Symmetry: D2
Subunit: 198 residues, 4 copies
Amino acid sequence: AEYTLPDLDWDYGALEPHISGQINELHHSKHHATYVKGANDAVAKLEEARAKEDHSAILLNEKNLAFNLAGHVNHTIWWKNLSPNGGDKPTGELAAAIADAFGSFDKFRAQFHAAATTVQGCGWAALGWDTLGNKLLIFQVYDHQTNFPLGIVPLLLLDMWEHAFYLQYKNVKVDFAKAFWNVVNWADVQSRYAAATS
Amino acid sequence: AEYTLPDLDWDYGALEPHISGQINELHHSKHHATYVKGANDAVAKLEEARAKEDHSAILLNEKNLAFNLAGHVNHTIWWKNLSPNGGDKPTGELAAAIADAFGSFDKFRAQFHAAATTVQGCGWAALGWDTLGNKLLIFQVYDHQTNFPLGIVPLLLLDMWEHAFYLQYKNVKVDFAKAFWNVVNWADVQSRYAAATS
Amino acid sequence: AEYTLPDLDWDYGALEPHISGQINELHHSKHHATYVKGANDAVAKLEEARAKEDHSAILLNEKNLAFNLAGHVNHTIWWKNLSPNGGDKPTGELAAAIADAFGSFDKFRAQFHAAATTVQGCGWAALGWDTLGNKLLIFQVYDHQTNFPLGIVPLLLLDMWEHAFYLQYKNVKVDFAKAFWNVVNWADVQSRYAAATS
Amino acid sequence: AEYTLPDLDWDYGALEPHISGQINELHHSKHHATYVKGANDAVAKLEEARAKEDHSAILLNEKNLAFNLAGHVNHTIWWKNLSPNGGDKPTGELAAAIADAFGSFDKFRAQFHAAATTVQGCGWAALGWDTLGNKLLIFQVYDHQTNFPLGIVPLLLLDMWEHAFYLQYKNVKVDFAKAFWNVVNWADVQSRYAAATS
Ligand SMILES: [Fe+3]
Ligand SMILES: [Fe+3]
Ligand SMILES: [Fe+3]
Ligand SMILES: [Fe+3]
């Protein structure tokens, strides 16, 4: 069936002071909603293109599909990676994993921070699981659909687009990137890692 | 552990006339080998960057990692998607799936062909499974790591980079794209779809 | 010599209500300043790379140079394309040009608006002069350095990055894009066109 | 008027052994011809889009325009940057310039070589003149239209796409990149630099 805008497991304001409610609100209700509509439209244009046997606009239809489905997939996971009762550090299996792959939770965290704060333009920082080599790796995503291999399982993401913090942090994206660690919902990531490693 | 250059399940020449042995040879032994080395180097630079607590070159390290791990992941699957005893059409579950999502195997195939022949520069055509919406979709990949959402499971790919056919088809990439249907190994794709839908 | 942050020909607030002073301020003093420093650093890294005969990081040095020199070049022109005493329509040579190349100033303006409001991620809308074919064309720039040919002379640009309007228009980028027409400084564009056509 | 496929100032074979005639032939007659047609088509789609007051496909029309006009602009200059009677080193003003901006012709040349041999996918190496800062700089172009600022004047380019050497050098692009120095037509570059610095 169609793609749909998910419900947050919390109130927009629940993340203050780390993330203003106004942000979460426009983010969810305007930005994410827009991707979901775009993903569905893209899918429909394809059907219509397929029926008329007219792929003249294949390049645009395929690019619209990737961009919008990618924004949807990303925000879908972002809402879950966040939580008012989170913060602290990972635990158990996930933590031993992380320390074994990035030397220590602190070192993982320095890299991830680096990756999110150096994007040239808009993008995200994401931790994922590589199934080919069975390794935990950090990628620097450009926009929403660029810079990472096919089949990588996403575990944790940090939205670096300006719409994600300009209202509250203005140009100080380094601050926003630090504040994030207070709202990460480790029960989710841990969960995702468990499923990915199965 | 490290990433490694896989072995082909066939002899380089096994695909003639559809795909010259000389191609398969340079492709596997030179191009793919290069990605695998690059993927391992990228991974190491990260470790070294992590130890020195020096992420000054984060952008390059992350981009090298995505590009090379992506070429590796892609060729890894390409070798399996090919077979001297393939061709024909998909069967069973996969075929009903394909006809249900693209109207008919013929229509799927017209779209896929369109997607591979219109790349602007180098890229690939790929069929993948979207887990968010549980749908079969075709994407037009740019280079190796661009244009598609995170977490998409790759099922079938068609290498559109010039190195994949210039020696034999020269600039006639439309011909190469047609010849491909004779060597697709449907037992593999079908297999992948089965695992993806589980 | 080095690259330097130019002075605005006006006060930050001079564009209200169309463009808030707070924006112009962070935009000029934080964002643009950052590109200028980055452009100079990029240039230096190259010298140092050239002296040591060590181009191991060529890809990053070249990408840093393009990104930062491009942001600098872009904002440099943006400040000039804006003016408190502007608005209205182009005049003389430029206007006949524009109507002859886009049918009418109104049609040019519909296209330009379309180009700026559909960027996927961050970018700009720019009108430039193609010297090869001697034509006026509109391009949709991605980020700061992507999507247009070498040697194109830039005449007018509209910054579509979120930092350019999020504080005041929030996610309503369509509004910001309309408000812009009130502050365009046609004496500048006209001037640039004159020099480009010489 | 329309865009047109230029005539070479030489015979396809004139560059052997450095560059096979077969290459120059398919390159000029197939590849470049394709960009020119594409550039004209893109321009027409815009007119038609403008008349119907229907910019639904703005993103594709603008991307087709940039890609094809960019390939055209690039090959246009490549044919001129090449010559059977070239090679050697730059002379006069251009040479003092080059040594002053890259330390020495040898150092310029090491950088340029680095830039062309590390492209991730398809692209070019280009020397251009920055008018904002009045400096000679080397850029690493991705595809044909990406990675460099607006208004940069192109002086010399080296086509790194696989179609530019696969037939003769196969995957050994490092060799092709070396062979190029024997056919550079310095009278052209010098000329371009003169006009750019005016
Ligand atoms: Fe976002
Ligand atoms: Fe390949
Ligand atoms: Fe800006
Ligand atoms: Fe070429």
